[PDB]
Amino acid sequence: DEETFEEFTARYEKEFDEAYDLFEVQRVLNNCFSYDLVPAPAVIEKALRAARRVNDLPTAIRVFEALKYKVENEDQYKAYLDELKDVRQELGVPLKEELFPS
Amino acid sequence: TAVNTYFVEKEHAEHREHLKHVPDSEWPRDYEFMNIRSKPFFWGDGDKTLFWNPVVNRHI
Amino acid sequence: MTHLERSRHQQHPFHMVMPSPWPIVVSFALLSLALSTALTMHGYIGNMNMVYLALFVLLTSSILWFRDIVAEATYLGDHTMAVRKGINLGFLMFVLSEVLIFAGLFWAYFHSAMSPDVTLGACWPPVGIEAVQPTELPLLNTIILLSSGATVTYSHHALIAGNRNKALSGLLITFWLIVIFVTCQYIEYTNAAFTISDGVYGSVFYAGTGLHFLHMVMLAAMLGVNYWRMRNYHLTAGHHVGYETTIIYTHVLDVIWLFLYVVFYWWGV
Amino acid sequence: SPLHTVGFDARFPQQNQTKHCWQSYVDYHKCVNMKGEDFAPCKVFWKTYNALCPLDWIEKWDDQREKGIFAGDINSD
Amino acid sequence: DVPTPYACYFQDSATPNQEGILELHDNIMFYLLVILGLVSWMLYTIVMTYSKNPIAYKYIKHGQTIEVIWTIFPAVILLIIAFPSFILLYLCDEVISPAMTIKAIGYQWYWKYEYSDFINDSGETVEFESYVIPDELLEEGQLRLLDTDTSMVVPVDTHIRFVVTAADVIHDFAIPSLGIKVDATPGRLNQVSALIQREGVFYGACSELCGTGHANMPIKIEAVSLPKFLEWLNEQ
Amino acid sequence: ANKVIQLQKIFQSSTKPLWWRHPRSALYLYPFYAIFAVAVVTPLLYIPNAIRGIKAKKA
Amino acid sequence: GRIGESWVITEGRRLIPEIFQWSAVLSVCLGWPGAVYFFSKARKA
Amino acid sequence: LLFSVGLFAVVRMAGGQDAKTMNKEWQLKSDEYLKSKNANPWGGYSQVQSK
Amino acid sequence: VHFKDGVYENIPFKVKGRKTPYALSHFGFFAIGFAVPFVACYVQLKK
Amino acid sequence: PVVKTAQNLAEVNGPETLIGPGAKEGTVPTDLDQETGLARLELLGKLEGIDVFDTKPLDSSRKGTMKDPIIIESYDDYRYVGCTGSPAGSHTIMWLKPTVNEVARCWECGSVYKLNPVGVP
Amino acid sequence: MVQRWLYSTNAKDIAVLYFMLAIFSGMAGTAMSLIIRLELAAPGSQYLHGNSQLFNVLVVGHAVLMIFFLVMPALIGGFGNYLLPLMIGATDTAFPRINNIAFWVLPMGLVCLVTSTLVESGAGTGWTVYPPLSSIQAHSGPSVDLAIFALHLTSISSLLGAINFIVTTLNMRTNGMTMHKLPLFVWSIFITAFLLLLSLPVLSAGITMLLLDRNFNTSFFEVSGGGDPILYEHLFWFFGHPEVYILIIPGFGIISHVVSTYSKKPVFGEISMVYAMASIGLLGFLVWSHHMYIVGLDADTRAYFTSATMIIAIPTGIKIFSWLATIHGGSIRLATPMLYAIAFLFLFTMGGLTGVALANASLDVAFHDTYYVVGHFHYVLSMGAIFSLFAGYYYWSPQILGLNYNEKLAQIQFWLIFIGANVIFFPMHFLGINGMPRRIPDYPDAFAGWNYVASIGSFIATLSLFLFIYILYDQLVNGLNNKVNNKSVIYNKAPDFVESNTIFNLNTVKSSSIEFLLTSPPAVHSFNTPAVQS
Numbered sequence A: 001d002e003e004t005f006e007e008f009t010a011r012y013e014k015e016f017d018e019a020y021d022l023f024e025v026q027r028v029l030n031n032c033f034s035y036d037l038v039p040a041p042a043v044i045e046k047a048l049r050a051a052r053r054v055n056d057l058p059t060a061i062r063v064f065e066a067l068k069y070k071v072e073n074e075d076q077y078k079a080y081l082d083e084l085k086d087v088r089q090e091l092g093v094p095l096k097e098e099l100f101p102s
Numbered sequence B: 001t002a003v004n005t006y007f008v009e010k011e012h013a014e015h016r017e018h019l020k021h022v023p024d025s026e027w028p029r030d031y032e033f034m035n036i037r038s039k040p041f042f043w044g045d046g047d048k049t050l051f052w053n054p055v056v057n058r059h060i
Numbered sequence C: 001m002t003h004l005e006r007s008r009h010q011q012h013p014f015h016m017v018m019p020s021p022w023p024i025v026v027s028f029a030l031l032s033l034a035l036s037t038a039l040t041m042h043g044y045i046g047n048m049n050m051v052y053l054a055l056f057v058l059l060t061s062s063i064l065w066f067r068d069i070v071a072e073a074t075y076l077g078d079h080t081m082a083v084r085k086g087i088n089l090g091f092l093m094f095v096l097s098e099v100l101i102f103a104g105l106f107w108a109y110f111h112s113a114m115s116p117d118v119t120l121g122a123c124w125p126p127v128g129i130e131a132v133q134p135t136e137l138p139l140l141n142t143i144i145l146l147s148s149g150a151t152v153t154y155s156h157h158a159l160i161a162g163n164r165n166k167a168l169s170g171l172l173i174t175f176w177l178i179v180i181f182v183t184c185q186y187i188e189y190t191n192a193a194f195t196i197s198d199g200v201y202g203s204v205f206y207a208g209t210g211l212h213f214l215h216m217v218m219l220a221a222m223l224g225v226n227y228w229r230m231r232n233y234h235l236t237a238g239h240h241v242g243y244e245t246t247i248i249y250t251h252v253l254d255v256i257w258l259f260l261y262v263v264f265y266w267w268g269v
Numbered sequence D: 001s002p003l004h005t006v007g008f009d010a011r012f013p014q015q016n017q018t019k020h021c022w023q024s025y026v027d028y029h030k031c032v033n034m035k036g037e038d039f040a041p042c043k044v045f046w047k048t049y050n051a052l053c054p055l056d057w058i059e060k061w062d063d064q065r066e067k068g069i070f071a072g073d074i075n076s077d
Numbered sequence E: 001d002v003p004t005p006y007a008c009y010f011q012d013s014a015t016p017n018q019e020g021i022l023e024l025h026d027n028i029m030f031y032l033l034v035i036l037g038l039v040s041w042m043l044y045t046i047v048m049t050y051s052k053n054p055i056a057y058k059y060i061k062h063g064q065t066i067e068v069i070w071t072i073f074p075a076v077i078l079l080i081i082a083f084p085s086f087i088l089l090y091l092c093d094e095v096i097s098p099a100m101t102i103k104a105i106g107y108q109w110y111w112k113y114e115y116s117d118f119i120n121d122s123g124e125t126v127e128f129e130s131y132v133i134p135d136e137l138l139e140e141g142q143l144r145l146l147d148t149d150t151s152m153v154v155p156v157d158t159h160i161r162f163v164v165t166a167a168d169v170i171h172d173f174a175i176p177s178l179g180i181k182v183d184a185t186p187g188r189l190n191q192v193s194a195l196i197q198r199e200g201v202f203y204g205a206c207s208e209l210c211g212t213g214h215a216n217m218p219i220k221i222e223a224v225s226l227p228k229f230l231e232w233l234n235e236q
Numbered sequence F: 001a002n003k004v005i006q007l008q009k010i011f012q013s014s015t016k017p018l019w020w021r022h023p024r025s026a027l028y029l030y031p032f033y034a035i036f037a038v039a040v041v042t043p044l045l046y047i048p049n050a051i052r053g054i055k056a057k058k059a
Numbered sequence G: 001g002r003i004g005e006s007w008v009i010t011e012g013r014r015l016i017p018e019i020f021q022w023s024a025v026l027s028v029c030l031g032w033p034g035a036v037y038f039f040s041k042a043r044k045a
Numbered sequence H: 001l002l003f004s005v006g007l008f009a010v011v012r013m014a015g016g017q018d019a020k021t022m023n024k025e026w027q028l029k030s031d032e033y034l035k036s037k038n039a040n041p042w043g044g045y046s047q048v049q050s051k
Numbered sequence I: 001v002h003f004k005d006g007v008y009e010n011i012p013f014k015v016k017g018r019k020t021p022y023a024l025s026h027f028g029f030f031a032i033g034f035a036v037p038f039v040a041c042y043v044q045l046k047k
Numbered sequence J: 001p002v003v004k005t006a007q008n009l010a011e012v013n014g015p016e017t018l019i020g021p022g023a024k025e026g027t028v029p030t031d032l033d034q035e036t037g038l039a040r041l042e043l044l045g046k047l048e049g050i051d052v053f054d055t056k057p058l059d060s061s062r063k064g065t066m067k068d069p070i071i072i073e074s075y076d077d078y079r080y081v082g083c084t085g086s087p088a089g090s091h092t093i094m095w096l097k098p099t100v101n102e103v104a105r106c107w108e109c110g111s112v113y114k115l116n117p118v119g120v121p
Numbered sequence K: 001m002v003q004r005w006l007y008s009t010n011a012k013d014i015a016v017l018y019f020m021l022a023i024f025s026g027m028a029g030t031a032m033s034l035i036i037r038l039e040l041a042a043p044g045s046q047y048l049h050g051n052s053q054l055f056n057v058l059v060v061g062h063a064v065l066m067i068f069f070l071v072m073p074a075l076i077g078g079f080g081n082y083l084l085p086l087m088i089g090a091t092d093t094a095f096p097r098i099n100n101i102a103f104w105v106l107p108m109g110l111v112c113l114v115t116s117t118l119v120e121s122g123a124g125t126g127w128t129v130y131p132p133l134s135s136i137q138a139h140s141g142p143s144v145d146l147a148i149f150a151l152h153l154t155s156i157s158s159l160l161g162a163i164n165f166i167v168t169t170l171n172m173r174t175n176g177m178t179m180h181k182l183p184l185f186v187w188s189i190f191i192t193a194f195l196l197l198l199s200l201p202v203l204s205a206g207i208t209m210l211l212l213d214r215n216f217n218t219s220f221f222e223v224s225g226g227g228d229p230i231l232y233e234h235l236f237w238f239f240g241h242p243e244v245y246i247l248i249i250p251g252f253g254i255i256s257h258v259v260s261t262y263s264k265k266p267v268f269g270e271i272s273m274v275y276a277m278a279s280i281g282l283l284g285f286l287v288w289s290h291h292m293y294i295v296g297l298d299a300d301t302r303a304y305f306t307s308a309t310m311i312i313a314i315p316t317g318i319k320i321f322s323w324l325a326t327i328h329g330g331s332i333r334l335a336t337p338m339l340y341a342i343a344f345l346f347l348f349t350m351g352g353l354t355g356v357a358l359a360n361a362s363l364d365v366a367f368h369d370t371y372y373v374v375g376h377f378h379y380v381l382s383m384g385a386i387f388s389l390f391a392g393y394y395y396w397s398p399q400i401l402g403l404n405y406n407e408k409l410a411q412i413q414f415w416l417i418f419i420g421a422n423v424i425f426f427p428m429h430f431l432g433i434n435g436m437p438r439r440i441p442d443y444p445d446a447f448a449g450w451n452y453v454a455s456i457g458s459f460i461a462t463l464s465l466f467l468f469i470y471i472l473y474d475q476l477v478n479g480l481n482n483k484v485n486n487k488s489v490i491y492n493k494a495p496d497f498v499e500s501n502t503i504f505n506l507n508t509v510k511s512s513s514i515e516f517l518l519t520s521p522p523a524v525h526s527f528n529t530p531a532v533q534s
């Protein structure tokens, strides 16, 4: 309802900046997914950067699963494809190709 | 107000003193409000009522 | 020390009450009264003295609780502003329920204004139904009751202001006026207006007047209890939990009596 | 009734007719108990009490007139 | 008439008032049905869709559009379901020349109907009781627990008034088939003008407890033509 | 007065029930309820013992 | 870039099974009284 | 469900049935009288509901 | 009043004791519940 | 045993040891030392500037992070406090269960809390 | 046990007594209503050989026990005095003696009714006490007097409970809570207390008038003197209409609470919630004479009353839409309290809309005092009293006592009781819509099959209740063995689907009510420091 993405986006990155442990990472990510605002690739990249800061690969797996299934959004796929591949091959957190065939 | 209430009570509101003795032949033009069957009397002694005041009506 | 006890007894205005037998005994008294009355008015045994003693002991238990509710307010104390506000609000809601009772009594016959019905009445004023009307008969007492209430409300205001010899004079005047009122109530014991045989129009008025003759008794009982307490001088001009109750009662009873005198006396005549 | 007595009724616009019989009966009893020669003044509402009003009310009023304690408020005539 | 077994809808109509009541009933029930269908399907789809929802939309509080939509819709819905009730009350309560008037008093576990509008031989008032025939003393071919020794008669294609009252306890004049239902106050009378356009036998029992023996309250209404009504009156 | 403070001090010293005001009244009232109400409620069901059993069976 | 839906396809393929199931549930919930009516000797069968 | 129906069946068997009606002849007499009086024509004249 | 741990003290039952292994109490509760309808039916008529 | 002045709130031992002397006849006693019950503890305090049962909310604006978690004063073992965002009402009502040894966090608010009781023997 | 229980003065220690009396009374009343349905299965004296007075008396006992002695003592008092002081955070409610005298004044009503049924006199005039049928003219003996004292004592206990509720919630509410942040169940009980206070005295006065007429050889409503029972019916309905709201509103509160705590999302406009509740409470008084359209009032009066009814209906629809908004767009864990809440949202809504349909001024010509109205209120009572109480019990029992319940047993119990209630109450609308009367042990020979299906449903319902009491026993005897194994759910709110399970150890149960954040029930005078909200 006529709410700017930029303010809350910047809040998400700035909270990710001072992520001391995984608790604030978890709470901020849950709040971000709480809105209907589908996360941007930039905020997901910042979240993965915070997760790499806190060193818990399961957070990365969970957020990838959340991106794959968060909202129907008229069943858009290629957006999901790019938003996953850019952040997979930006630095490397190889996690999707193992839980699926198990 | 008190003194004029006392005056009006002693002027024409004292007529109820002789209402106890009244013939049953000049009753006011009343209606179905009375003269109907009443509760049967089982307990009590005084004129089929708790208070022995045979003054309200002359019909039993 | 001081801080810990202050926090542990500050928001706790409730005493660690002993195993008080008041609930079971009062419940037992009410149940005995109910069953005994049912057996006596229409049953197998028509004895009257035993049920009279049952009523007497129920009243003794009620008086015991009612004197405790004010003795523990001063002898035990342990009260704050919040509990005083709660007790006052409880007395206000009690008198509001009494006002609702009075309103129901009024509406029992006050809804027949323009005669909307057809038969069995529906005639205001009830022409033809002219027995000894209980209307305008006790107004000689209602006017003096209004005068007494007017002259004692401000006396009780000066009471709560000072609680001094002026308060004693006001209390004595109240005792005299309530004694006069109970005397003039009992003088019309049997033959007040009439009896109920036919034409129930003033009989409901007589019953409504009769059933309210206990609130003044309760007021007199509280006044006497406070009189005894201040003779014992336990209650100073401090936690006057009973003085406030009596002043609010006398400030609401005059209002309700005024509302009663507004209609039912000059309306329809 | 032969399916034709009044037709359209317009005496009282509102639906409820609780207070209707008294007014339609007072004039009838007054005209009947005054002259008894010609009923022309009250010849237009014959059915308002015979069939349009509860005849229990009519018989109760007749018995009350016999006993002298009328349900309504009229004079002694 | 007779309550049809295993029924799930209203009885057969007998009078225009009752069929108008039925029309108002079905008109109301249409919108009630659509409302209940809407709410039931909403419940069903919610529970069958969001039961698997992993993350809950927990920051939605305002919803102004739906707020105004379901704040303004019920008003017009209620107005459009209330207007037919008003017009039917206006039409039915119209006291359009009630041509017949009989007494109907609810006595202690029986009825004593008095017919004063008509006469029997010369000016006399016809009155008789209505006693329910006992179950043990039933005659073969009757209706159990309800059938009476003698019942009331009524002309067809006319207008009738049922003067209802009581003697000691309040009764009920419950005849759903004829579309009349007025309480029997102990002292207060009530006038209802029932006009019948259909012949037949209409049953009935008092819908008000009369103490203990209210399990057998015979109210049987039999509709006859004008010549048959004259023959019955002459016989009575 | 001259007895409020001493009474409160003694009651605080002796934290005991019965509130010290009416011990004789309590001892007088305690047996009365048991003597009276129990003996007046027992007939209520004792007398209809022979009355009870009205089967009123019909067939 | 409007990938896939076309709301109509997925919307129908999800609702139609759901609507059919809901209608069948209502049909059963109203046919059980009808089942009682049939099984009971309503017509001496 | 099977316990409920079984205990209902056994308690009804123990209680028994003592109605002098509900038999076929009563229903046929009723519908014959109804046809004589022509009541509920557009409905169900048959009221059997039991043996 | 502060001498209760708060485990089973909130119910007027007692696990300790061979007098009632939580069966006689429940049997008695069933009995008192079924008493009023059964006795009400029995006093004027058959069960 | 006898009248106690209790003019100061730091000289009263025993809540019932004070009754409050009054006057029989003359003028009304002043509402300072003539009240039965603990009511003097609040009335004299607010007469001299001491309140009872403060309703002041905690530091809502401060997030209470690791460096400076907020401090609550309660000598009891446990506590019932929480956060509603930096303003008065921001999110759904929520509160925590602080303990003497460990800490607790506010989940969605991220406001880390701490239990601070006064030293006890 | 006498030293602390029979002489109790603690709200927590007496709420459990409230519950015990509620469950015992319910089991007895369900047994007697089982009987009532059992003689209704087939025409004739299948089990009651004559004596329709016994049938009437059993009906009166059923109605009175469920109304005044079962659920009003349960959700008003038992839940109120266990949650409201607990949710506020105050150590103890003001004057627990009030609660004790309110509780202890119940049982003698039970014994006086049981002996009134025992005596040959009996009270067989319905749970409504309309004259003259309850006076010496028709019913002699002590049954009427015992019932009158029973209702008087129940009213007194209710008034005391309302007094305690009002004083606790308004005089010493905790500092953190204010007017604009007060939870929902307490608002419900507050409005309930207001309506109870404005409703009790008129009933007390009218019923005292009837008792005096029966005793003082007079008559104010009876025609014997010129009175008219229309006034008494006015007064009785003026009391009665608030009573259903009194018993139903705390159900609204608890249902809103459970759907809020289980949807993981906040309420939808709690200000709107309290607006709806307050509007309902204040508007309940506009229909004092809406229950007696059959009397013969004026057309304008009927129009005004039906307008008031249709106005009253709207806030309920607003509340239903609010619940739908709360459930929409949220994760749902399909636990048993959700099952009860959904059954409420369905069947209570359908019954209420049926009643709104009947609420037409001229529609009582078809349903009033028929089986349609019993199908009407059985629905809403069962949904908002039986199912509300079930939801509350299964929603608070694992913590208020520390004892869990078998989830499979709970599920099968819910399914059994739901199907039984549906199959019982549904046919009675078909019964009424034909026009069959009410309060008759024997009925004409038309709807035998519907009565039969009602009876088998009643047996299903009583089997469900027996399973429920067996569940109670198993919970009370096997709680520690059930907590350790996988027989029951030990965390009602599962973690959010982002959050790891190890971190979840310190996020056990966090919701919008303090009593869930407490440990195992501590000493009664807990809460040494009052809770404060920042």
Ligand code: HEA
Binding pocket: K022, K023, K025, K026, K027, K029, K030, K033, K034, K036, K037, K040, K059, K062, K063, K066, K067, K070, K071, K126, K127, K128, K374, K378, K381, K382, K385, K386, K389, K390, K421, K424, K438, K439, K440, K458, K461, K462, K465, K468
């Ligand atoms: C709580 C309210 C309540 C409940 C539960 C019931 C339960 C039942 N009721 Fe009743 N009933 C009323 C409230 C209730 N009723 C009222 C107010 C009247 C008015 C009387 C009048 O109209 O004159 C009435 C009247 C009434 C009649 C009118 C009879 C006549 O016309 O004379 C009938 C007829 O069969 C009937 C049947 C039943 C049946 C078969 C059940 C069965 O469902 C019994 C099984 C019970 C339920 C399925 C609910 C579970 C109840 C419990 C107590 C479970 C216990 C556990 C907990 C409470 C924790 N009820």
Ligand code: HEA
Binding pocket: E035, E073, E074, E075, E077, E078, K244, K245, K247, K248, K290, K291, K309, K310, K313, K314, K316, K317, K318, K320, K348, K349, K351, K352, K353, K355, K356, K358, K359, K360, K367, K368, K369, K373, K374, K376, K377, K380, K381, K384
């Ligand atoms: C739990 C108790 C309870 C509850 C909750 C209710 C709820 C309602 N009741 Fe009922 N009622 C009784 C108990 C109850 N009732 C009892 C005991 C009787 C007497 C039976 C006896 O005497 O034997 C009775 C009788 C009764 C009558 C007279 C019938 C009679 O003879 O019995 C009427 C009619 O005016 C009525 C109306 C309503 C209405 C309008 C509601 C509403 O509050 C329903 C609430 C639900 C909603 C209305 C849902 C919201 C609706 C919408 C979604 C909006 C849709 C419509 C619009 C556009 C506004 N009730």
Ligand SMILES: [Cu+2]
Binding pocket: K241, K287, K290, K291
């Ligand atoms: Cu209502």
